[PDB]
């Protein structure tokens, strides 16, 4: 049995309305009895039980033991260590795992939108770019929206560790040049810890 502790969604920690969770999952269970134990050590305080309820989403033969942990926004954003102590009737000893946010002083991202390259206009679908750089930690959230509606046709490159110790990434929206020609205004919305309201967006037009 190998244990994998996972962090909460970047959006989930930034907006007070969402519930950020910490996930403790396991793969490859030993053949014997499923006697498992969990000791969630939250850097001092301890919940122990939490909500370890493995909702066995059985498909074919797969089904793992997941253990989510409701996290208090600030506690995660302040560098608390969330440890998961997984055990089982088969493992020689209990395997522990610990997660926290990327330790370091936060830096506010700078967002710049870039219109389609004049060479791309020769094509039917021009692409709008959004440069988000100089931020830290990496945990960020970028979305695109036109007229107050999310645009699903866009991809975002993972954070690249720049020379300055900070991070940077690019989000590319793909829109029909017909729409771009109409002078529509698109917006690059970015959410990040060190931003004024954990939110900021930049528009593009013709």
């Amino acid at each position, epitope marked *: 049995p190998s244990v994998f502790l996972f962090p909460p969604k970047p959006k989930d920690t*930034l*907006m*007070i*309305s*969402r519930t950020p969770e910490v996930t403790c999952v396991v793969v490859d269970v030993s053949q014997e009895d499923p006697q498992v134990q969990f000791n969630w050590y939250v850097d001092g305080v301890q919940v122990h039980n939490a909500k370890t309820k493995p909702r066995e989403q059985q498909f074919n033969s797969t089904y793992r033991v997941v253990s989510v942990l409701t996290v208090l926004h600030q506690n995660w954003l302040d560098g608390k260590e969330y440890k998961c102590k997984v055990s089982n009737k088969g493992l020689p000893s209990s395997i522990e795992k610990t997660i926290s946010k990327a330790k370091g002083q936060p830096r506010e991202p700078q967002v710049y939108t870039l219109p389609p390259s004049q060479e791309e206009m020769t094509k039917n679908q021009v692409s709008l770019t959004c440069l988000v750089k100089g931020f830290y930690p990496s945990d960020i959230a970028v979305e695109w*929206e036109s*007229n*107050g*509606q999310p645009e699903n046709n866009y991809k975002t490159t993972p954070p690249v560790l720049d020379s300055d110790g900070s991070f940077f990434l690019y989000s590319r929206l793909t829109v029909d040049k017909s729409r771009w020609q109409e002078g529509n*205004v*698109f*917006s690059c919305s970015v*959410m990040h810890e060190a931003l*004024h*309201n*954990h*939110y*900021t*967006q930049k*528009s593009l037009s013709l």
Partner: antibody
Amino acid sequence: EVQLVESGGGLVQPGRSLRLSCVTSGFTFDDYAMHWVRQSPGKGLEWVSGISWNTGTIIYADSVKGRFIISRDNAKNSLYLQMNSLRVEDTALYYCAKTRSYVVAAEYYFHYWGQGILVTVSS
Amino acid sequence: YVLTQPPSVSVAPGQTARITCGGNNIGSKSVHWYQQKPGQAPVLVVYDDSDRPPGIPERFSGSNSGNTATLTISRVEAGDEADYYCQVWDSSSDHAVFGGGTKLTVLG
């Protein structure tokens, strides 16, 4: 596209009551604190009340405290305003508003406004 | 809290209309601006001091520091004729205070 549609009532005799409603569309209601802002027929806007996403934090205007009762229903994407103990001074166009804040204590700004329903209080 | 903005402001087309929103230590708060056209619900033209919502024209600039917040409209046009309100959330008492409103009369 985001649209806030209000209903409520209209003309009413002082002392009587009215329950306003605001059904929202175009965004996740659960994520935003809704507010009611009225506009006195002829001069300026006046903030009336507001309620957090989880209903946890309810707040009212001093010139409304005790009378009006603001409510919300995430499951139904609806915002209400139980106007109890009406008064002629309350005659105004009531607007529904959507804020846009994620930080614990934000300086609210009304991102989206409804067309505004009218309540007339008189004998 | 108290906000104070001039009743009216008359500027001929082309000129820049600067609407002043007075406030005691308003620089510690983030002013917001709304545009209310006759018989139309107000619209957010500027928020958090200088930010503009998608679609609002570039000529709409926000300013705020010390005891004054100044909405500036470059190349004022007839379509910009309406009432402008400066709002601010008073953190000290949980109340949203709006200014009296200013009438941008594009001179004709």
